[PDB]
Each structure stands twice: as C-alpha cells, then as structure tokens.
Design a protein around this motif. Sequence first.
Motif, PDB file in Angstrom:
ATOM      1  N   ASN A 229      40.332  81.423  33.816  1.00 12.27           N
ATOM      2  CA  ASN A 229      39.441  81.197  32.674  1.00 12.27           C
ATOM      3  C   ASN A 229      39.968  81.915  31.424  1.00 12.27           C
ATOM      4  N   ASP A 230      41.151  82.514  31.546  1.00 13.12           N
ATOM      5  CA  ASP A 230      41.752  83.261  30.452  1.00 13.12           C
ATOM      6  C   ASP A 230      42.652  82.409  29.551  1.00 13.12           C
ATOM      7  N   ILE A 231      43.164  81.279  30.056  1.00 14.56           N
ATOM      8  CA  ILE A 231      44.327  80.643  29.412  1.00 14.56           C
ATOM      9  C   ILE A 231      43.973  79.990  28.061  1.00 14.56           C
ATOM     10  N   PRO A 232      44.745  80.321  27.014  1.00 11.70           N
ATOM     11  CA  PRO A 232      44.515  79.788  25.679  1.00 11.70           C
ATOM     12  C   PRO A 232      44.629  78.276  25.582  1.00 11.70           C
ATOM     13  N   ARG A 233      43.699  77.688  24.839  1.00 10.24           N
ATOM     14  CA  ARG A 233      43.696  76.267  24.541  1.00 10.24           C
ATOM     15  C   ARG A 233      43.533  76.125  23.030  1.00 10.24           C
ATOM     16  N   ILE A 234      44.306  75.227  22.418  1.00 11.33           N
ATOM     17  CA  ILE A 234      44.171  74.947  20.989  1.00 11.33           C
ATOM     18  C   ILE A 234      44.086  73.440  20.737  1.00 11.33           C
ATOM     19  N   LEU A 235      43.557  73.087  19.577  1.00  8.55           N
ATOM     20  CA  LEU A 235      43.421  71.704  19.178  1.00  8.55           C
ATOM     21  C   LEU A 235      44.320  71.463  17.973  1.00  8.55           C
ATOM     22  N   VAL A 236      45.140  70.415  18.048  1.00  8.43           N
ATOM     23  CA  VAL A 236      46.070  70.081  16.973  1.00  8.43           C
ATOM     24  C   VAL A 236      45.867  68.643  16.509  1.00  8.43           C
ATOM     25  N   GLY A 237      45.614  68.465  15.211  1.00  6.48           N
ATOM     26  CA  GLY A 237      45.638  67.141  14.595  1.00  6.48           C
ATOM     27  C   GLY A 237      47.018  66.905  14.016  1.00  6.48           C
ATOM     28  N   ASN A 238      47.640  65.788  14.381  1.00  5.97           N
ATOM     29  CA  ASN A 238      49.002  65.484  13.959  1.00  5.97           C
ATOM     30  C   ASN A 238      49.022  64.361  12.919  1.00  5.97           C
ATOM     31  N   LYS A 239      50.182  64.193  12.274  1.00  6.91           N
ATOM     32  CA  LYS A 239      50.441  63.123  11.301  1.00  6.91           C
ATOM     33  C   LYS A 239      49.694  63.362   9.992  1.00  6.91           C
ATOM     34  N   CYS A 240      49.557  64.627   9.600  1.00 12.91           N
ATOM     35  CA  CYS A 240      48.845  64.977   8.357  1.00 12.91           C
ATOM     36  C   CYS A 240      49.613  64.530   7.116  1.00 12.91           C
ATOM     37  N   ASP A 241      50.876  64.155   7.305  1.00 18.88           N
ATOM     38  CA  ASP A 241      51.711  63.634   6.211  1.00 18.88           C
ATOM     39  C   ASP A 241      51.257  62.259   5.724  1.00 18.88           C
ATOM     40  N   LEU A 242      50.582  61.512   6.594  1.00 17.41           N
ATOM     41  CA  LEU A 242      50.064  60.192   6.253  1.00 17.41           C
ATOM     42  C   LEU A 242      48.711  60.341   5.555  1.00 17.41           C
ATOM     43  N   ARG A 243      48.732  60.994   4.394  1.00 20.42           N
ATOM     44  CA  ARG A 243      47.521  61.392   3.675  1.00 20.42           C
ATOM     45  C   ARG A 243      46.557  60.240   3.421  1.00 20.42           C
ATOM     46  N   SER A 244      47.085  59.096   3.001  1.00 16.51           N
ATOM     47  CA  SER A 244      46.240  57.955   2.657  1.00 16.51           C
ATOM     48  C   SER A 244      45.544  57.358   3.880  1.00 16.51           C
ATOM     49  N   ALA A 245      46.130  57.550   5.066  1.00 19.39           N
ATOM     50  CA  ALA A 245      45.629  56.935   6.301  1.00 19.39           C
ATOM     51  C   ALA A 245      44.771  57.851   7.192  1.00 19.39           C
ATOM     52  N   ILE A 246      44.511  59.075   6.748  1.00 19.33           N
ATOM     53  CA  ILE A 246      43.730  60.031   7.537  1.00 19.33           C
ATOM     54  C   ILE A 246      42.319  59.481   7.789  1.00 19.33           C
ATOM     55  N   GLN A 247      41.905  59.493   9.057  1.00 19.53           N
ATOM     56  CA  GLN A 247      40.585  59.006   9.478  1.00 19.53           C
ATOM     57  C   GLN A 247      39.654  60.114   9.983  1.00 19.53           C
ATOM     58  N   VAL A 248      40.218  61.241  10.416  1.00 17.33           N
ATOM     59  CA  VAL A 248      39.440  62.344  10.968  1.00 17.33           C
ATOM     60  C   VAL A 248      39.293  63.448   9.932  1.00 17.33           C
ATOM     61  N   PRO A 249      38.082  63.603   9.356  1.00 15.03           N
ATOM     62  CA  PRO A 249      37.887  64.678   8.386  1.00 15.03           C
ATOM     63  C   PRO A 249      38.024  66.062   9.015  1.00 15.03           C
ATOM     64  N   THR A 250      38.584  67.002   8.262  1.00 17.47           N
ATOM     65  CA  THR A 250      38.774  68.372   8.740  1.00 17.47           C
ATOM     66  C   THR A 250      37.477  69.017   9.239  1.00 17.47           C
ATOM     67  N   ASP A 251      36.380  68.833   8.503  1.00 21.68           N
ATOM     68  CA  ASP A 251      35.100  69.440   8.875  1.00 21.68           C
ATOM     69  C   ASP A 251      34.610  68.973  10.250  1.00 21.68           C
ATOM     70  N   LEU A 252      34.756  67.678  10.517  1.00 20.03           N
ATOM     71  CA  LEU A 252      34.377  67.093  11.801  1.00 20.03           C
ATOM     72  C   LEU A 252      35.181  67.715  12.936  1.00 20.03           C
ATOM     73  N   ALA A 253      36.493  67.763  12.750  1.00 19.96           N
ATOM     74  CA  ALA A 253      37.408  68.334  13.749  1.00 19.96           C
ATOM     75  C   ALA A 253      37.158  69.817  13.967  1.00 19.96           C
ATOM     76  N   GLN A 254      36.833  70.530  12.888  1.00 22.04           N
ATOM     77  CA  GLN A 254      36.563  71.963  12.969  1.00 22.04           C
ATOM     78  C   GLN A 254      35.267  72.259  13.727  1.00 22.04           C
TER      79      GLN A 254
END
Length: 165
Positions: free
Chosen positions: A108-133
């Motif tokens: 139950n110790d092992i680190p887990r992180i969440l990564v959103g990829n393809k942030c370079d495609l600015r015009s095509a972003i569908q997942v808002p930062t606030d939602l993901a956060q």
Amino acid sequence: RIFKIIVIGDSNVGKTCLTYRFCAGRFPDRTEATIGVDFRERAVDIDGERIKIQLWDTAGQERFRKSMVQHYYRNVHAVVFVYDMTNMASFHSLPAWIEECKQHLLANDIPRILVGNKCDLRSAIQVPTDLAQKFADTHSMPLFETSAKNPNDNDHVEAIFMTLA
Ligand SMILES: Nc1nc2c(ncn2[C@@H]2O[C@H](COP(=O)(O)OP(=O)(O)NP(=O)(O)O)[C@@H](O)[C@H]2O)c(=O)[nH]1
Ligand SMILES: [Mg+2]
C-alpha cells in the motif's frame, strides 16, 4: 538497484513515446500498437546512488495485454497512469486502470501518479486541467500535464519520472 515503473493506460495515449523519450532522450517517430511485454532502461544517479530505472511500456490494446498483467505487476515499484489530453474517452478510462492496479498491488506504499500527455496539441485539448486535478485529488495522486513530443522545452517528462525514483 532496479526501479521498475509501469506505465498504464488506453491504446494511443503515448505510453511508448513517453517511455522512449525518457530512456533514449528523444521522441520515437515510428510507433505501432505495443504487443506483449516491452520495457526500456536508463541508468540515473539520485543523491549519489546509481539506479537503473526500468519503464514498462504496457499494451493498451486488450488483445495484446490480457495475459500480461501479472508480468506488468511483478516486483513493481511505481505506477504511472496516462491519458491523452486531446481524448476525453482516455480520461474516462482511468477508474478502470486504477482498479486493476488496486487488485494487483500488495504493498500500500507504492507511488502512483497521473499524467496527461500530448499537451503540445493546444487547440485539440479536451480534458480541462481543473477536471483532471479534481480526479487526481480524489485518488490521492499528483497530476502532471506534459508532452512526449514537445514539452521538454517546458522542463517536464524527465522530471516526472526522475521524481518517482
Ligand atoms: N503530438 C503528440 N503526439 C504524441 C505524443 N505522444 C504520443 N503521440 C502520438 O500518439 C500516437 C500514439 O503513441 P504511442 O506511444 O504509440 O501510444 P501507446 O500509448 O504506446 N499505444 P499502445 O498502448 O497501443 O501501445 C502516435 O502517433 C504518437 O506519435 C505527444 O506528446 N504529442
Ligand atoms: Mg505502445
């Protein structure tokens, strides 16, 4: 010391590109759907200790991953969940990957992180930062938004994996 980090998420989110970017220092311009068991390695130095970071580039496609999950989770040290910032469906998938992880982890110790990829495609972003956060907060994981292809000039992919070690 080997530090095994598995990279989990839907097909096409960029797991192969992220792992190759970290281990080889550049973006892989020829990729196909990953089949079976693939991992790549990079020798790093953290606080004076030489460590071999071993990134398991898991298959997103069900046909290619189905019998492989216990290989993925054998002696794992950290888990990276990836979604595609331009594909809301890939974000909606996350609870299913997180639950697979819960079922396969003993420690139950092992680190887990969440990564959103393809942030370079600015015009095509569908997942808002606030939602993901908000979602990341609910699962007690940090959130990173990055790009395997282009964000390096924003100081990001290396830092994300290094910090896990
Ligand atoms: N613009 C952009 N394209 C990216 C980025 N990361 C990956 N891609 C592209 O997205 C596609 C999928 O990348 P890939 O790493 O193969 O995905 P995967 O998650 O490994 N797929 P699978 O689970 O099926 O093996 C490729 O066409 C790749 O070039 C990124 O940061 N930016
Ligand atoms: Mg792949």
